[PDB]
RNA sequence: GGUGAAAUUCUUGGAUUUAUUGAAGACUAACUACUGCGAAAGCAUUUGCCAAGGACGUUUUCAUUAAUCAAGAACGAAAGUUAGGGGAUCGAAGAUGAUCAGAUACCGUCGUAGUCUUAACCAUAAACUAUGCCGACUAGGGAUCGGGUGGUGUUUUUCUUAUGACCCACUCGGCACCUUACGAGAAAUCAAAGUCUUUGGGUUCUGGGGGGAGUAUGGUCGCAAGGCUGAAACUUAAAGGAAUUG
RNA sequence: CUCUAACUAUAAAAAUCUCUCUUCUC
């Protein structure tokens, strides 16, 4: 992979999981 | 090259180089005894004079500020000393 | 070539001559030198101005060469030394000028950067002078006593 | 040639048999006062043509106006101002170069200096003028470039601004054009600037007319017969 | 000055479907706008030199019909932000107007050159054909 | 290619020594003319060596 | 590995340069890696001057020339043959192609 | 129009061009270079004001005030976020018409946020010269930029001197360049990447096989985007660098 | 041992690939 798009994928994963954190509270 | 005498550079070579790089750090400047076209008095001036040197006798500014030596006033006479 | 705050490496300076004693052709008296030094000081010119004027107008090469002592020391012995050394005072003057410019027009950021550089230099020099104890150990330079010392 | 859609959202005539011809006259300032012809729709009341003519501008080379070829790169726009019937007058409207000469002067290894200034004529014609100068390679120069300092550029621009202001504020636009055609201001600029920097190819350009007081009938009549 | 009633042909030559449009000295009065795509069928060849000759010959015919005899030329590329370069065809139109009876003089280029503005279409990486 | 005849005309044209040495001071104004610097060079060298000094006009045209 | 000692940019001591659009594909490129050609040409082609020459008013007309630089992205410069793909030791030769005609 | 070819789209309410004008915001073409300024980002119409700085000149002034620097701070491209102002161009999203097996991609047209601003956050970039800063030395050559040197110098031109602009020999500083190795490197190459096994000028900060992974977690700054800090379990004999021949 | 003048004008589409890797000593 281009490291750029792997970083983007992990970044979006982080955003989704932190929205999960926010919705859980 | 590869063999010199740094004690005894050629005087032409010595002045050829830059100051602060010679054997002894000597100044390039000098002092000129300048006389105004009006008054016969003698006024000493540093060659690279910074301020507008004025003869105390009369308001006859002799040398004007410049990057290098001050420019004389077209009528004075200078003596090297 | 140091130039703390700019990578400039110049060496613009002066190479004073090797002869410690006076030039052989000088006709002025060392004492008369001293009285003209003190009177120009009474006029208020700083010792740098004093030196440049005595070099331009008269055969005064270095007052240390002629009188055997240096201009600031002549002033101190004669009791005309300023409370703040001249270089420092010029630093305060420049710093306050930059401060006035900056407060006048906000968005200039390189002005702020140069102000930080000038404050660094002035703190440094003040530290030195306090170590040599020319300044009082409580002498401090921030903004307002700065403006008072500008006066 | 076809592939049409005709998204329209035969009473045909001959539209050029229904048209008149008119003459063009240049002011007394130039040599060849006649300029040429102009086709116009026929003058009928309720949109008389002479209403339409007043306002027209024509771009004409100075070579034709003067006969000589050295004015080839010049270019004057003349405005239609007075109509006499089958024949109409023109007053000066603008000056410019042919772009090709401008580019020929614009070369590498020699910085160009521009001077822009809005100046009011002696009479009322509010104008804007431009000046273009190029550094000249000296008569002995081995240096491969001919660049000018920024301070030299500022001084030269100030000098040219002063000269242009003087020339325009001296006389009226008729006299101003009579000065323009011999391009005397060019030699004046070179005169006052040759001490600073050589400045080859000084040229006054894009004389732009901005304002005109009311009409000045009498002078226009004086400029044409 | 042997009574050459003048005109300006004003060929506008793009990289497709060039133009020949003769008008009066002031430019207010058109004579035979007839263009490059007028006489060709492909719509790919609108820029082709043959379109230039065809358009030029018919506008020259209309020019003789009206009465214009001498023509000045305003060659213009697309200019503005687009390519600054004269269209391939328009030169052939110039040649034809030179040929067909018309007297020609005072050739000029009036391509509108901008002073660096109006960011050119295409994005950073630009056209990626 | 080289046949012996060619070697021989090369020899006899090469063995040709001209008459007077083309310097001789005989051509181009008796006693040569040169610039001041080489003149004083020979002077310092301490040789009589007849002479004709002249200027050079060191200014360089565009070239 | 550094392909070109001059880094193939020609910036070398400027930080950042304004970009200029390519003339064919309109790709923005730094104004120094912006291969550039003086397209000076006679307004009429030499093949058609004669028709103009003998069929025109204003005997001995100037016949001016059209002037413009062309700025290419290097992709266009290579494909449109403006710039060739030279060899190694021949890369460090910067003199133009020997003044095409002289 | 537009393209490799085409279509979408606008057009006898006359589109496209042909002229004059006027509005808006935009940018400052060509001058534009192995050239300049700045700490870096970055900086290109003119003019005035405001303050600032480098380098050069200095027989001017003080006398170690110096270098790098954890901690702390200021700037910090573009995109982004607030809010208010503007709203041309160009264009993420979306809408389209093509190509193709599919193409919600590359080409083609419209079009929102942004693009420009005004105060505040963001502090990341291949923020690259992939070369930390301050020092001293070491080889030949040229030009170029800034200053200052000397010409019995040239044209300048104001008769003549003065300037300016040039020519020469310089010198100090700056971006750099060319040739070479007699030094290095593994080489590509470097005039520093030399003065390093013949191993020591002063100094900060980083790395220890590749993945896992800049991920997990805890802090910490931020509204948010996210940034700084930062592993391990585990999995492998390679990954990688430069050059050679195909 | 004297010098600095020419010039043009293309791009449509083309995806994938199953083994088998084996010495240099006189
Ligand atoms: Mg391609
Ligand atoms: Mg720098
Ligand atoms: Mg290049
Ligand atoms: Mg219309
Ligand atoms: Mg410009
Ligand atoms: Mg510059
Ligand atoms: Mg820190
Ligand atoms: Mg932004
Ligand atoms: Mg589609
Ligand atoms: Mg899309
Ligand atoms: Mg698109
Ligand atoms: Mg659009
Ligand atoms: Mg980073
Ligand atoms: Mg590891
Ligand atoms: Mg990782
Ligand atoms: Mg975390
Ligand atoms: Mg490799
Ligand atoms: Mg398959
Ligand atoms: Zn006097
Ligand atoms: Zn391109």
Curated annotation (Swiss-Prot), chain D:
Transmembrane segments: none annotated. GO terms for biological process: translation. One of its GO terms (cellular component) is cytosolic small ribosomal subunit. It is found in: Cytoplasm. Keywords: Acetylation, Cytoplasm, Ribonucleoprotein, Ribosomal protein. Pfam families: Ribosomal_S3Ae. The keyword Ribonucleoprotein applies. The modification N-acetylalanine is found at residue 1. Its main location: cytoplasm. InterPro entries: Ribosomal_eS1 (IPR001593), Ribosomal_eS1_CS (IPR018281), Ribosomal_eS1_euk (IPR027500). GO terms for molecular function: structural constituent of ribosome. Belongs to the eukaryotic ribosomal protein eS1 family. Component of the small ribosomal subunit. Mature ribosomes consist of a small (40S) and a large (60S) subunit. The 40S subunit contains about 33 different proteins and 1 molecule of RNA (18S). The 60S subunit contains about 49 different proteins and 3 molecules of RNA (25S, 5.8S and 5S). This is Small ribosomal subunit protein eS1. It comes from Kluyveromyces lactis (strain ATCC 8585 / CBS 2359 / DSM 70799 / NBRC 1267 / NRRL Y-1140 / WM37).
Swiss-Prot record, chain E:
GO terms for molecular function: structural constituent of ribosome. It comes from the Eukaryota. InterPro entries: Ribosomal_uS11, Ribosomal_uS11_CS, Ribosomal_uS11_sf. Residues 120-129 have a biased composition (Basic residues). Residues 108-129 are annotated as: Disordered. It holds the Pfam family Ribosomal_S11. The keyword Lipoprotein does not apply. Keywords: Ribonucleoprotein, Ribosomal protein. Disulfide bonds: none annotated. Coiled coil: none annotated. One of its GO terms (biological process) is translation. One of its GO terms (cellular component) is ribonucleoprotein complex. The keyword Acetylation does not apply. Belongs to the universal ribosomal protein uS11 family. This is Small ribosomal subunit protein uS11. It comes from Kluyveromyces lactis (strain ATCC 8585 / CBS 2359 / DSM 70799 / NBRC 1267 / NRRL Y-1140 / WM37).
């Amino acid at each position: 992979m281009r490291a750029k798009w792997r970083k983007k994928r992990t970044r979006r994963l982080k955003r989704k999981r932190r929205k999960v954190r926010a919705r859980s509270k | 090259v590869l063999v010199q005498d740094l004690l005894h550079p050629t005087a032409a070579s010595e002045a050829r180089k830059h100051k602060l790089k010679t054997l002894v750090q000597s100044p390039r400047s000098h002092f000129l005894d300048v006389k105004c076209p009006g008054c016969l008095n003698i006024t000493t001036v540093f060659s690279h004079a910074q301020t507008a040197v004025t003869c105390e006798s009369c308001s006859t500014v002799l040398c004007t500020p410049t990057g290098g030596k001050a420019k004389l006033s077209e009528g004075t006479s200078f003596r090297r000393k | 070539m140091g130039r703390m705050h700019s990578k400039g490496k110049g060496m613009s300076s002066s190479a004073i001559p090797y002869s410690r004693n006076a030039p052989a052709w000088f006709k002025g008296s060392s004492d008369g030198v001293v009285e003209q030094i003190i009177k120009y000081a009474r006029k208020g010119l700083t010792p740098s101005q004093i030196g440049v004027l005595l070099r331009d107008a008269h055969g005064v090469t270095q007052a240390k060469v002629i009188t055997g002592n240096k201009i600031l020391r002549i002033l101190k012995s004669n009791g005309l030394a300023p409370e703040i050394p001249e270089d420092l005072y010029f630093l305060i003057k420049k710093a306050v000028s930059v401060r006035k410019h900056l407060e006048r027009n906000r968005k200039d950021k390189d002005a702020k950067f140069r102000l930080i550089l000038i404050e660094s230099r002035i703190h440094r020099l003040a530290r030195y002078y306090r170590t040599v104890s020319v300044l009082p150990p409580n002498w401090k330079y921030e903004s307002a006593t700065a403006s008072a010392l500008v006066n | 040639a076809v592939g049409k859609n005709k998204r329209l959202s035969k009473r045909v005539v001959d539209p050029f048999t229904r048209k008149e011809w008119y003459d063009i006259k240049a002011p007394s300032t130039f040599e060849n006062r006649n300029v040429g012809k102009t086709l116009v729709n026929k003058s009928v009341g309720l949109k008389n043509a002479s209403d339409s003519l007043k306002g027209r501008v024509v771009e004409v080379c100075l070579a034709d106006l003067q006969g000589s070829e050295d004015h080839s790169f010049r270019k004057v726009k003349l405005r239609v101002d007075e109509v006499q019937g089958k024949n109409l007058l023109t007053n000066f409207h603008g000056m410019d170069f042919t772009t090709d000469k401008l580019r020929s002067m614009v070369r590498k290894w020699q910085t160009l200096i521009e001077a822009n200034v809005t100046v009011k004529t002696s009479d009322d014609y509010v104008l804007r003028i431009f000046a273009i100068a190029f550094t000249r390679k000296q008569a002995n120069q081995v240096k491969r470039t001919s660049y000018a300092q920024s301070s030299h550029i500022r001084q030269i621009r100030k000098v040219i601004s002063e000269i242009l202001t003087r020339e325009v504020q001296n006389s009226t636009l008729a006299q101003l054009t009579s000065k323009l055609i011999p391009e005397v201001i060019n030699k004046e600029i070179e005169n006052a600037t040759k001490d600073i920097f050589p400045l080859q190819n000084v040229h006054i350009r894009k004389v732009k007319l901005l304002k005109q007081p009311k009409f000045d009938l009498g002078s226009l009549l004086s400029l044409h017969g | 000055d042997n009574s050459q009633v003048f005109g300006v042909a004003r060929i506008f030559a793009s990289f497709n479907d060039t133009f020949v449009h003769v008008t009066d000295l002031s430019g207010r009065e058109t004579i035979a706008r007839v263009t490059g795509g007028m006489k060709v069928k492909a719509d790919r060849d609108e820029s082709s030199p043959y379109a230039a000759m065809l358009a030029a010959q018919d506008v020259a015919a209309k020019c003789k019909e009206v009465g214009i005899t001498a023509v000045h030329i305003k060659i213009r590329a697309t200019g503005g932000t687009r390519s600054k370069t004269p269209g391939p065809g328009g030169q052939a139109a110039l040649r034809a107007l030179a040929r067909s009876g018309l007297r020609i003089g005072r050739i000029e280029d009036v391509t509108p050159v901008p002073s660096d503005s109006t960011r050119k279409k295409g994005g950073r990486r630009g056209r990626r054909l | 290619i080289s046949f012996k005849l060619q070697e021989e005309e090369r020899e006899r044209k090469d063995q040709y020594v001209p008459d007077v040495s083309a310097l001789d001071l005989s051509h181009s104004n008796d006693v040569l003319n040169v610039d001041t610097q080489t003149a004083e060079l020979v002077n310092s060298l301490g040789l009589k060596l007849p002479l004709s000094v002249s200027s050079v006009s060191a200014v360089r045209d565009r070239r | 590995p550094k392909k070109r000692a001059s880094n193939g940019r020609n910036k070398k001591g400027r930080g950042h340069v304004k970009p200029v659009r390519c003339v064919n594909c309109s790709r923005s490129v730094p104004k120094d890696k912006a291969i550039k050609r003086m397209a000076i040409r006679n307004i009429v082609e030499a093949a058609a001057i004669r028709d103009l020459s003998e069929a025109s008013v204003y005997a001995e007309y100037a016949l001016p020339k059209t002037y413009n630089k062309l700025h290419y992205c290097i992709s266009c410069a290579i494909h449109a043959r403006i710039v060739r793909v030279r060899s190694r030791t021949d890369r460090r030769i910067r003199a133009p192609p020997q003044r095409p005609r002289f």
